[PDB]
């Protein structure tokens, strides 16, 4: 009769709240996802706001953080461990350093089979071309692009075909990007005016989803600094 618990948060007041939990009954996704980080995304020096971003982690994959980033990882890949601090304190410190070693850590997490969602909600009317191009720009900032140029190019072509729908996207619509355990991407669209979902294409090339979500979580110039900041803090609590 009297619901008393908050299940969503207002990432940006111009669009609808982001749910803390996304299940296969709410969206066309494969498992239960929990909000990890969130924030607004801006572009260019004019700080032009383009969308609100929600990053989600599969509930059943929360164990993968500590299974991957542990005291073994720490001494295997770092040679500057402060022995006065615990392993989790050192791992947290190194993740917050926000340097090339932080990227390595996030990339290793992504290789562990960690399943994720990105919910992208435009704050103005746009179109699928611009959403797609924004993902390409993000992917292209990953530090390892130059060492995987040809394979990545094949993946970016898959990304074009994955955007099966063409045309307008309304403010407050949702693009849903799901990262599968194997690294593939599944795309989906939510028409919020008519409350209709359209499943779109897939990208099976692993580099695409790996580079995209790595840049969301730890990019030097990430699309949403606040989503990066909140997601990293939340990942640290799972150590």
GROMACS .gro file of N, CA and C in nm, residues 121-232:
model
  336
  121UNK      N    1   2.104   0.734  -2.255
  121UNK     CA    2   1.976   0.805  -2.266
  121UNK      C    3   2.000   0.948  -2.313
  122UNK      N    4   1.971   0.979  -2.440
  122UNK     CA    5   1.997   1.115  -2.490
  122UNK      C    6   1.913   1.221  -2.421
  123UNK      N    7   1.976   1.336  -2.393
  123UNK     CA    8   1.910   1.450  -2.332
  123UNK      C    9   1.857   1.548  -2.436
  124UNK      N   10   1.863   1.513  -2.562
  124UNK     CA   11   1.809   1.591  -2.672
  124UNK      C   12   1.783   1.494  -2.785
  125UNK      N   13   1.698   1.536  -2.877
  125UNK     CA   14   1.670   1.456  -2.996
  125UNK      C   15   1.797   1.438  -3.077
  126UNK      N   16   1.821   1.317  -3.123
  126UNK     CA   17   1.943   1.283  -3.196
  126UNK      C   18   1.906   1.174  -3.297
  127UNK      N   19   2.002   1.090  -3.335
  127UNK     CA   20   1.975   0.985  -3.432
  127UNK      C   21   2.078   0.874  -3.413
  128UNK      N   22   2.053   0.760  -3.480
  128UNK     CA   23   2.138   0.644  -3.455
  128UNK      C   24   2.279   0.669  -3.506
  129UNK      N   25   2.292   0.745  -3.614
  129UNK     CA   26   2.424   0.779  -3.667
  129UNK      C   27   2.510   0.845  -3.559
  130UNK      N   28   2.453   0.940  -3.485
  130UNK     CA   29   2.533   1.011  -3.385
  130UNK      C   30   2.564   0.922  -3.266
  131UNK      N   31   2.469   0.841  -3.221
  131UNK     CA   32   2.500   0.745  -3.115
  131UNK      C   33   2.615   0.654  -3.158
  132UNK      N   34   2.605   0.597  -3.277
  132UNK     CA   35   2.710   0.508  -3.325
  132UNK      C   36   2.844   0.580  -3.332
  133UNK      N   37   2.846   0.699  -3.392
  133UNK     CA   38   2.973   0.771  -3.405
  133UNK      C   39   3.033   0.801  -3.269
  134UNK      N   40   2.949   0.828  -3.169
  134UNK     CA   41   3.002   0.854  -3.036
  134UNK      C   42   3.071   0.733  -2.976
  135UNK      N   43   3.016   0.614  -3.000
  135UNK     CA   44   3.083   0.491  -2.956
  135UNK      C   45   3.216   0.473  -3.028
  136UNK      N   46   3.219   0.501  -3.158
  136UNK     CA   47   3.344   0.487  -3.233
  136UNK      C   48   3.449   0.582  -3.178
  137UNK      N   49   3.412   0.706  -3.151
  137UNK     CA   50   3.508   0.801  -3.095
  137UNK      C   51   3.563   0.750  -2.963
  138UNK      N   52   3.476   0.695  -2.878
  138UNK     CA   53   3.521   0.643  -2.750
  138UNK      C   54   3.618   0.528  -2.769
  139UNK      N   55   3.583   0.434  -2.858
  139UNK     CA   56   3.666   0.316  -2.880
  139UNK      C   57   3.804   0.358  -2.927
  140UNK      N   58   3.808   0.458  -3.015
  140UNK     CA   59   3.931   0.500  -3.079
  140UNK      C   60   4.029   0.566  -2.985
  141UNK      N   61   3.987   0.601  -2.863
  141UNK     CA   62   4.080   0.654  -2.764
  141UNK      C   63   4.152   0.545  -2.684
  142UNK      N   64   4.118   0.419  -2.703
  142UNK     CA   65   4.180   0.317  -2.621
  142UNK      C   66   4.329   0.307  -2.654
  143UNK      N   67   4.415   0.294  -2.553
  143UNK     CA   68   4.560   0.299  -2.579
  143UNK      C   69   4.611   0.192  -2.672
  144UNK      N   70   4.539   0.082  -2.690
  144UNK     CA   71   4.589  -0.031  -2.768
  144UNK      C   72   4.536  -0.036  -2.910
  145UNK      N   73   4.468   0.069  -2.955
  145UNK     CA   74   4.410   0.069  -3.089
  145UNK      C   75   4.518   0.043  -3.194
  146UNK      N   76   4.629   0.116  -3.185
  146UNK     CA   77   4.733   0.108  -3.287
  146UNK      C   78   4.793  -0.032  -3.299
  147UNK      N   79   4.790  -0.110  -3.191
  147UNK     CA   80   4.843  -0.246  -3.195
  147UNK      C   81   4.739  -0.350  -3.236
  148UNK      N   82   4.618  -0.308  -3.270
  148UNK     CA   83   4.515  -0.399  -3.317
  148UNK      C   84   4.436  -0.338  -3.432
  149UNK      N   85   4.502  -0.260  -3.518
  149UNK     CA   86   4.432  -0.174  -3.613
  149UNK      C   87   4.340  -0.254  -3.705
  150UNK      N   88   4.395  -0.356  -3.772
  150UNK     CA   89   4.316  -0.428  -3.872
  150UNK      C   90   4.201  -0.505  -3.806
  151UNK      N   91   4.229  -0.580  -3.700
  151UNK     CA   92   4.122  -0.652  -3.632
  151UNK      C   93   4.015  -0.556  -3.581
  152UNK      N   94   4.056  -0.440  -3.529
  152UNK     CA   95   3.958  -0.345  -3.478
  152UNK      C   96   3.872  -0.291  -3.592
  153UNK      N   97   3.934  -0.262  -3.707
  153UNK     CA   98   3.858  -0.212  -3.822
  153UNK      C   99   3.748  -0.309  -3.863
  154UNK      N  100   3.778  -0.439  -3.865
  154UNK     CA  101   3.674  -0.537  -3.895
  154UNK      C  102   3.561  -0.527  -3.793
  155UNK      N  103   3.596  -0.509  -3.665
  155UNK     CA  104   3.495  -0.495  -3.562
  155UNK      C  105   3.411  -0.370  -3.578
  156UNK      N  106   3.474  -0.258  -3.617
  156UNK     CA  107   3.396  -0.136  -3.638
  156UNK      C  108   3.298  -0.153  -3.753
  157UNK      N  109   3.332  -0.233  -3.855
  157UNK     CA  110   3.235  -0.259  -3.962
  157UNK      C  111   3.116  -0.338  -3.910
  158UNK      N  112   3.140  -0.438  -3.825
  158UNK     CA  113   3.030  -0.507  -3.758
  158UNK      C  114   2.943  -0.408  -3.682
  159UNK      N  115   3.005  -0.308  -3.619
  159UNK     CA  116   2.929  -0.210  -3.542
  159UNK      C  117   2.832  -0.134  -3.632
  160UNK      N  118   2.872  -0.103  -3.756
  160UNK     CA  119   2.780  -0.039  -3.850
  160UNK      C  120   2.659  -0.127  -3.877
  161UNK      N  121   2.682  -0.255  -3.903
  161UNK     CA  122   2.571  -0.345  -3.930
  161UNK      C  123   2.487  -0.370  -3.806
  162UNK      N  124   2.547  -0.360  -3.686
  162UNK     CA  125   2.469  -0.384  -3.565
  162UNK      C  126   2.362  -0.279  -3.546
  163UNK      N  127   2.384  -0.158  -3.596
  163UNK     CA  128   2.285  -0.050  -3.591
  163UNK      C  129   2.190  -0.073  -3.708
  164UNK      N  130   2.098  -0.167  -3.687
  164UNK     CA  131   2.004  -0.206  -3.792
  164UNK      C  132   1.900  -0.097  -3.815
  165UNK      N  133   1.853  -0.034  -3.709
  165UNK     CA  134   1.757   0.075  -3.723
  165UNK      C  135   1.828   0.203  -3.765
  166UNK      N  136   1.764   0.278  -3.853
  166UNK     CA  137   1.812   0.408  -3.897
  166UNK      C  138   1.707   0.513  -3.866
  167UNK      N  139   1.753   0.634  -3.833
  167UNK     CA  140   1.662   0.745  -3.817
  167UNK      C  141   1.668   0.814  -3.683
  168UNK      N  142   1.558   0.881  -3.647
  168UNK     CA  143   1.557   0.968  -3.531
  168UNK      C  144   1.552   0.887  -3.402
  169UNK      N  145   1.611   0.944  -3.298
  169UNK     CA  146   1.606   0.896  -3.161
  169UNK      C  147   1.559   1.013  -3.076
  170UNK      N  148   1.452   0.993  -3.002
  170UNK     CA  149   1.398   1.101  -2.921
  170UNK      C  150   1.477   1.118  -2.791
  171UNK      N  151   1.482   1.241  -2.743
  171UNK     CA  152   1.521   1.266  -2.605
  171UNK      C  153   1.446   1.172  -2.512
  172UNK      N  154   1.521   1.113  -2.420
  172UNK     CA  155   1.473   1.017  -2.320
  172UNK      C  156   1.451   0.876  -2.375
  173UNK      N  157   1.475   0.851  -2.504
  173UNK     CA  158   1.487   0.713  -2.551
  173UNK      C  159   1.612   0.650  -2.488
  174UNK      N  160   1.624   0.517  -2.497
  174UNK     CA  161   1.739   0.445  -2.443
  174UNK      C  162   1.803   0.357  -2.551
  175UNK      N  163   1.934   0.368  -2.565
  175UNK     CA  164   2.016   0.266  -2.629
  175UNK      C  165   2.080   0.179  -2.521
  176UNK      N  166   2.059   0.048  -2.533
  176UNK     CA  167   2.110  -0.051  -2.438
  176UNK      C  168   2.221  -0.130  -2.506
  177UNK      N  169   2.340  -0.127  -2.447
  177UNK     CA  170   2.454  -0.204  -2.495
  177UNK      C  171   2.487  -0.308  -2.389
  178UNK      N  172   2.476  -0.436  -2.425
  178UNK     CA  173   2.508  -0.545  -2.334
  178UNK      C  174   2.639  -0.611  -2.375
  179UNK      N  175   2.732  -0.620  -2.280
  179UNK     CA  176   2.859  -0.691  -2.299
  179UNK      C  177   2.841  -0.833  -2.247
  180UNK      N  178   2.858  -0.930  -2.336
  180UNK     CA  179   2.844  -1.072  -2.302
  180UNK      C  180   2.973  -1.125  -2.239
  181UNK      N  181   2.964  -1.244  -2.178
  181UNK     CA  182   3.080  -1.300  -2.110
  181UNK      C  183   3.196  -1.322  -2.206
  182UNK      N  184   3.167  -1.355  -2.332
  182UNK     CA  185   3.268  -1.379  -2.434
  182UNK      C  186   3.323  -1.249  -2.494
  183UNK      N  187   3.279  -1.132  -2.448
  183UNK     CA  188   3.324  -1.005  -2.501
  183UNK      C  189   3.241  -0.947  -2.614
  184UNK      N  190   3.147  -1.023  -2.669
  184UNK     CA  191   3.061  -0.971  -2.774
  184UNK      C  192   2.964  -0.866  -2.720
  185UNK      N  193   2.911  -0.784  -2.810
  185UNK     CA  194   2.811  -0.683  -2.777
  185UNK      C  195   2.674  -0.717  -2.837
  186UNK      N  196   2.568  -0.693  -2.760
  186UNK     CA  197   2.430  -0.700  -2.807
  186UNK      C  198   2.367  -0.563  -2.791
  187UNK      N  199   2.312  -0.509  -2.898
  187UNK     CA  200   2.249  -0.378  -2.897
  187UNK      C  201   2.097  -0.389  -2.898
  188UNK      N  202   2.032  -0.291  -2.834
  188UNK     CA  203   1.887  -0.286  -2.817
  188UNK      C  204   1.846  -0.140  -2.807
  189UNK      N  205   1.721  -0.111  -2.842
  189UNK     CA  206   1.671   0.025  -2.840
  189UNK      C  207   1.536   0.028  -2.770
  190UNK      N  208   1.516   0.129  -2.686
  190UNK     CA  209   1.389   0.149  -2.618
  190UNK      C  210   1.327   0.280  -2.663
  191UNK      N  211   1.213   0.270  -2.731
  191UNK     CA  212   1.133   0.386  -2.770
  191UNK      C  213   1.049   0.424  -2.649
  192UNK      N  214   1.090   0.530  -2.579
  192UNK     CA  215   1.023   0.561  -2.452
  192UNK      C  216   0.888   0.627  -2.472
  193UNK      N  217   0.866   0.697  -2.584
  193UNK     CA  218   0.734   0.755  -2.608
  193UNK      C  219   0.628   0.644  -2.615
  194UNK      N  220   0.651   0.544  -2.700
  194UNK     CA  221   0.556   0.436  -2.721
  194UNK      C  222   0.585   0.314  -2.636
  195UNK      N  223   0.687   0.320  -2.551
  195UNK     CA  224   0.730   0.208  -2.468
  195UNK      C  225   0.737   0.078  -2.549
  196UNK      N  226   0.825   0.080  -2.649
  196UNK     CA  227   0.850  -0.032  -2.737
  196UNK      C  228   1.000  -0.059  -2.740
  197UNK      N  229   1.037  -0.187  -2.741
  197UNK     CA  230   1.176  -0.229  -2.748
  197UNK      C  231   1.204  -0.290  -2.884
  198UNK      N  232   1.322  -0.261  -2.938
  198UNK     CA  233   1.367  -0.324  -3.062
  198UNK      C  234   1.505  -0.383  -3.039
  199UNK      N  235   1.514  -0.516  -3.047
  199UNK     CA  236   1.644  -0.580  -3.044
  199UNK      C  237   1.714  -0.554  -3.176
  200UNK      N  238   1.839  -0.513  -3.168
  200UNK     CA  239   1.919  -0.485  -3.287
  200UNK      C  240   2.030  -0.587  -3.298
  201UNK      N  241   2.140  -0.548  -3.361
  201UNK     CA  242   2.242  -0.644  -3.400
  201UNK      C  243   2.344  -0.671  -3.291
  202UNK      N  244   2.440  -0.754  -3.326
  202UNK     CA  245   2.546  -0.799  -3.237
  202UNK      C  246   2.680  -0.769  -3.301
  203UNK      N  247   2.780  -0.749  -3.218
  203UNK     CA  248   2.919  -0.740  -3.260
  203UNK      C  249   2.991  -0.855  -3.192
  204UNK      N  250   3.042  -0.950  -3.271
  204UNK     CA  251   3.112  -1.065  -3.215
  204UNK      C  252   3.261  -1.041  -3.196
  205UNK      N  253   3.320  -0.945  -3.268
  205UNK     CA  254   3.459  -0.908  -3.247
  205UNK      C  255   3.477  -0.853  -3.105
  206UNK      N  256   3.564  -0.918  -3.027
  206UNK     CA  257   3.579  -0.890  -2.885
  206UNK      C  258   3.641  -0.754  -2.856
  207UNK      N  259   3.729  -0.706  -2.943
  207UNK     CA  260   3.797  -0.581  -2.915
  207UNK      C  261   3.699  -0.466  -2.903
  208UNK      N  262   3.588  -0.472  -2.976
  208UNK     CA  263   3.496  -0.358  -2.980
  208UNK      C  264   3.439  -0.333  -2.842
  209UNK      N  265   3.374  -0.434  -2.784
  209UNK     CA  266   3.318  -0.420  -2.652
  209UNK      C  267   3.421  -0.403  -2.544
  210UNK      N  268   3.537  -0.466  -2.560
  210UNK     CA  269   3.643  -0.449  -2.461
  210UNK      C  270   3.693  -0.306  -2.460
  211UNK      N  271   3.724  -0.251  -2.579
  211UNK     CA  272   3.775  -0.114  -2.582
  211UNK      C  273   3.668  -0.015  -2.537
  212UNK      N  274   3.542  -0.038  -2.575
  212UNK     CA  275   3.435   0.054  -2.539
  212UNK      C  276   3.416   0.060  -2.387
  213UNK      N  277   3.402  -0.055  -2.322
  213UNK     CA  278   3.374  -0.051  -2.179
  213UNK      C  279   3.498  -0.016  -2.097
  214UNK      N  280   3.617  -0.054  -2.142
  214UNK     CA  281   3.739  -0.003  -2.079
  214UNK      C  282   3.741   0.150  -2.078
  215UNK      N  283   3.707   0.214  -2.190
  215UNK     CA  284   3.708   0.360  -2.193
  215UNK      C  285   3.600   0.420  -2.105
  216UNK      N  286   3.484   0.354  -2.095
  216UNK     CA  287   3.382   0.402  -2.002
  216UNK      C  288   3.432   0.399  -1.858
  217UNK      N  289   3.508   0.296  -1.824
  217UNK     CA  290   3.541   0.272  -1.685
  217UNK      C  291   3.669   0.340  -1.641
  218UNK      N  292   3.762   0.361  -1.733
  218UNK     CA  293   3.892   0.413  -1.693
  218UNK      C  294   3.960   0.497  -1.801
  219UNK      N  295   3.890   0.539  -1.905
  219UNK     CA  296   3.952   0.622  -2.006
  219UNK      C  297   4.017   0.746  -1.945
  220UNK      N  298   4.136   0.779  -1.996
  220UNK     CA  299   4.198   0.906  -1.963
  220UNK      C  300   4.104   1.023  -1.989
  221UNK      N  301   4.037   1.022  -2.104
  221UNK     CA  302   3.935   1.120  -2.139
  221UNK      C  303   3.805   1.044  -2.160
  222UNK      N  304   3.749   0.996  -2.050
  222UNK     CA  305   3.632   0.910  -2.059
  222UNK      C  306   3.509   0.991  -2.102
  223UNK      N  307   3.411   0.924  -2.161
  223UNK     CA  308   3.290   0.997  -2.204
  223UNK      C  309   3.217   1.065  -2.089
  224UNK      N  310   3.214   1.001  -1.971
  224UNK     CA  311   3.150   1.056  -1.851
  224UNK      C  312   3.245   1.042  -1.733
  225UNK      N  313   3.317   1.148  -1.697
  225UNK     CA  314   3.407   1.138  -1.581
  225UNK      C  315   3.336   1.092  -1.455
  226UNK      N  316   3.211   1.133  -1.434
  226UNK     CA  317   3.143   1.092  -1.312
  226UNK      C  318   3.106   0.944  -1.316
  227UNK      N  319   3.068   0.893  -1.433
  227UNK     CA  320   3.039   0.749  -1.443
  227UNK      C  321   3.165   0.667  -1.418
  228UNK      N  322   3.279   0.714  -1.470
  228UNK     CA  323   3.407   0.652  -1.438
  228UNK      C  324   3.435   0.656  -1.289
  229UNK      N  325   3.416   0.773  -1.226
  229UNK     CA  326   3.448   0.788  -1.085
  229UNK      C  327   3.359   0.700  -0.997
  230UNK      N  328   3.229   0.698  -1.024
  230UNK     CA  329   3.139   0.618  -0.941
  230UNK      C  330   3.157   0.469  -0.968
  231UNK      N  331   3.183   0.432  -1.093
  231UNK     CA  332   3.202   0.290  -1.121
  231UNK      C  333   3.329   0.235  -1.056
  232UNK      N  334   3.439   0.309  -1.064
  232UNK     CA  335   3.564   0.263  -1.003
  232UNK      C  336   3.546   0.248  -0.852
   0.00000   0.00000   0.00000
